[PDB]
Structures are given as C-alpha cells and as structure tokens.
C-alpha cells in the first residue's frame, strides 16, 4: 500500500470546488492509500498570521476535513507543530540544502526568514512518512523537485533511509471554475465572492451565487466547455455534489432551460452545505475533535520518530543508545 | 539565582588554555548560577562533519566537561538534538527574523544553508532556559545582539514570555597564549601544534611543549607581559594549573632561572593531564556517561518544554488543551 501525504494550510476555508476537486476524492483514496493529512501550522507562520485567529483556523481545517469524510482510523490527521519530528528532520535537511537552492524557490521591515527556509521543512513533512505520492499542483513542482534532490543528497552523503516522492493525485476531481468567470479556477481568495462558494458560506448565499453565475440567458443543459463554459461549469458542480454522470444530468434536463436547471442545482448546493455544515459544527464544536487529533498526532509521531532517529544516526547527531 | 547557558561545539578538543580560561571557572560558578551546558550537535552539522567522527566527539566533549569537574546535579549537561525544544523554538524565532538579518551575521557545490540559518537556532538554545548570561567572546557579539532583538520582537508581536540575555562570564580566567607565539591566544586549531597543549595530548608531549615554548634564554621568573611575554605566559599556565598566586610563584622562583622553572611547570602540566585524562577515560569509557547525559537531557527538556509551549500559544501554533 502506497503512502500519501498532503499538507493543509490552515489559512483559508476550502471552497466547494476544493471539495469536488480534492477533498471528496480523499474520502475514497484513504481506503487504498496510507494517507497523512497534516495541518501545517508551522508553515502557517512563515506568512503573517493573527496569533488568535491562527489557532482557530486550525480547528476549522481539521473539522472541514473530518466533515468531508476523512476517517481517523484510515488516514492520519494531525497538526504539524505537535509532531516534533517535522522541525527536527527539517533542520537536518536544511544543513544539506544550499542557499542558492532556497533562493531559487522564492522565484518560481524585512523579508521574513520563514519564507526562505520553509522548503526543507516541506521536504521533511513528506519524507518522515516515506511518502510515495504528494497530491499537489504546478506551483508545487519546484518544491517536490527539491525534496527529491534533498532525499538523493541525504541517501548519498549519509545512509540510504529516505524515500523520494512523486507528485500524484489518485482520483483526479472535476475542474470547478469561478461562478462569475468560468475561464479561471475557483479560488477561496477571490476579490469577487460571487465567484466562489465557501464550504462555510451561508447556504442561502451559496444558493444565490449559483443563481448569480454568469451564463447565457437560456440554453440547453449540455456540457460544452469550449463554447458554453458558463453552464458547463455549473453542470460540473452539479455532477460533483451529486455523483450523477454528466450525460445523465444532460439526460434529466433534456428540453429544460437554464432556469429550471439552475434552480435545481441551487437547491442541491444549499442542500449539501447543510449536510456538510451540520457535520462541521458537530466536529468543530466537539470534545471528540481533541481526541481525534490526539490519536492522529500519536500515529504520525510514531512513524516520523523512527524516520528522524534513522536520520540522526546517519549524520552523527545525538548518542548511540 | 541567575541562569547561565553555554553551548559547546563538539568539534575540537579544548586546549589547556581553554581549561584555565573557561572550564575551571565553570566548576566554581555552577554553585552560584543555574548553568546549562549544551553540546550543540545540531549546530555541529551546519559545518561539514564525518557522520561517524561526529557522534564520537560529542561523547568526548561531554567527558571533557565532566572530567573538568562539571557536576551533573548542579549544572545541566545535555546534547542539543535530544531536546526537541531547540529546533522547535528555533523555527519560531526564524519566522520573525529577517533575511537581511541572517545575511549580515555571515559578514561579521553551494553554501550550506545551516551556515545562514543557525542564528535563530542559537537564540533558541539560549532563551529556552530564560538565560540571563552567556559566557562568550567578541565574535559572538553579533549573535547575542540578534538574540536580544529576536526576544524583543517576540515579546512585542506576541505575549512577553522570553528573557533577553547578557554576555557575561562570572569569573574570568587567565589569558593563556600560544606557547611558541605568546602574542596570540592558544587555539586548538593551530597549524603549529607546539603552540597549544590539548587536554588530550600525550602528557609527555605536553611536557616537551612547555620546554619548547619560545622564551628568552634565561631570565628571572617575574611576570612582565609587555616585555617578557614568553616566560610571563608560562607563569600564567603554572598559576592556572596550580592556584598559586603569581606573586607566590615569583616568590618561589626568586633567584632561579628559566630552566629550573620550566622543568617544574613541565612536570606540573604532565602531572595535571594525567589527573584529568584518568578522569576523562573513566567517563568517556563508562556506562554512567549515558546515565548522566540522560539525566541532563530530561532536566533541560522539562525546562525548555514549558518555554516552547508558552511560545506556541503566543503565536497560535497547535491547539488549546
């Protein structure tokens, strides 16, 4: 069984496109891969954060992932800072990185140092679990290139204990787009909020956002990305939130107009966010969330600990006991 | 009671000038200060080290310090990498350091990154114990300046939990110099090894090095640094290894020549290294060394742990439990 590792910025709420595109897939793939879901609070603080806001968003993300259907006895879900291994391994991998290397990543009162020196810590976050696959996008290429390099350097200079990862996503999800700009993916940080639907939107507001999506005035409900990207996008959302093949949706809306369909979808989105958000509050506001992240921290420690100890011995840190 | 923190590179053996100048003092001051002696193996690896050589030199330094008379129930003597707090706190203090800051320190196949990013980790090594005083020399000024700055930044941006240190050495020792160049201090890395006496020299060899010291052909045994620095230096060694006031040595050698005196000192050095080195082997080669460094690690953890946890809470890492 391969091991999957995804780190999760606890900075912003995932959109529903982030649900369709990634989180929903995870809930399958956690039965076919040994998945590590890591809320990277120590990465969070390289960028600016509000001390109080930041400890909150971490529970938010943990609950969001638990609501999505991540199962704590199938994946490991944990907060980075609570696994010391991460910054230990990160330091080792920093001593073999070059300055020029860390500088190049930055290309692809002062400049906070975390913005320069996170790359080795990202590497350590992966390799501690002997991760084979990392589900990330094209702005993360330079990172995985350096993680592969840093594993090669470490296995050559010191003993071979690390595991080069590949960038892979087991079941790719459907490309959701901006509701009021279908040629651009759905970002949680859109200046135009009618462009996205947060998993933590007021359901009614998401409903009105579906209705607000830029589409032609009327049309058939037929998937055509190249020429009718407006309605095509909404059909992707519809299919994604319901598991209805796109040709089945097309079938069910044969001879219906945009209005009938948009109204149905707008009730599906509203329906779904209520099922999600009632799960989400029941986790975010629950004593069992501390129990779960405790279990998920101990899991991730037990694994990463042995990776750090193999690394220390390989470089001559510490003692022999 | 103030708290003293000294980090100890495990890279080279201390000279006897390092004993007179620093280590001997520590054996007093550990009754008047809460002393943390930290063998910085994680600093060791920013520079190049042999994986096998490096884990050895760490026991060497631990034994050297224990032989010197550091007492494990009065100071805390520990290996850095075995206290996770160090790289945890180091990471926090890195996110608030600037790039320009770390770059400036460097002034006072590629450039290993540890050489740029150790400063915050040096800071963390100090502040985790709320250290008031750090016994270091003038090439360490820029470091303590930055540690004071990084504590000020942390106590302003987040809660006030850190303790700015001062550079202080409680009982200064006597300035030993190079045996064959008395105008230059005694370095362990001299290309000319007749210049220094290692605490791990063959005692006879150290004897012959005393005899070899550049002095006038004959003279009175009178302390005169400015004009007879040769014999003056040896008198400093003599006084330092024996606790005989310099005016008492002068007294005891009244009407004796360099030859009588050099011979006496050469037997004192030889005598002393045998008392030391028999202590040193009995530690370096002893099962109790693991017990001692274990006790010294647990001590240092219990203290540093609470400092990291106060820091995490102050920045919003982790959870509230």
Author numbering:
A (entry chain A), B (entry chain A): 1 to 108, 117 to 329
Give the article text:
Chuangxinmycin (CXM) is a promising antimicrobial compound targeting bacterial tryptophanyl-tRNA synthetase (TrpRS), an essential enzyme in protein synthesis. TrpRS catalyzes the ligation of Trp to its cognate tRNA, forming tryptophanyl-tRNA (Trp-tRNA), which is required for the accurate translation of genetic codes into proteins. Importantly, bacterial TrpRS exhibits significant structural and functional differences compared to its mammalian counterpart, making it an attractive target for the development of selective antibiotics. Structurally, CXM is a tryptophan (Trp) mimic but is characterized by a unique dihydrothiopyran heterocycle, which distinguishes it from other known antibiotics and contributes to its distinct physicochemical properties.
To ensure rigorous structural comparative analysis, we also determined the structures of SaTrpRS in the absence of substrates or inhibitors (apo-SaTrpRS) and SaTrpRS in complex with Trp (SaTrpRS/Trp complex) at resolutions of 3.04 Å and 2.32 Å, respectively (ESI†). The CXM complexes show high conformational similarity to Trp complexes and apo proteins (ESI†).
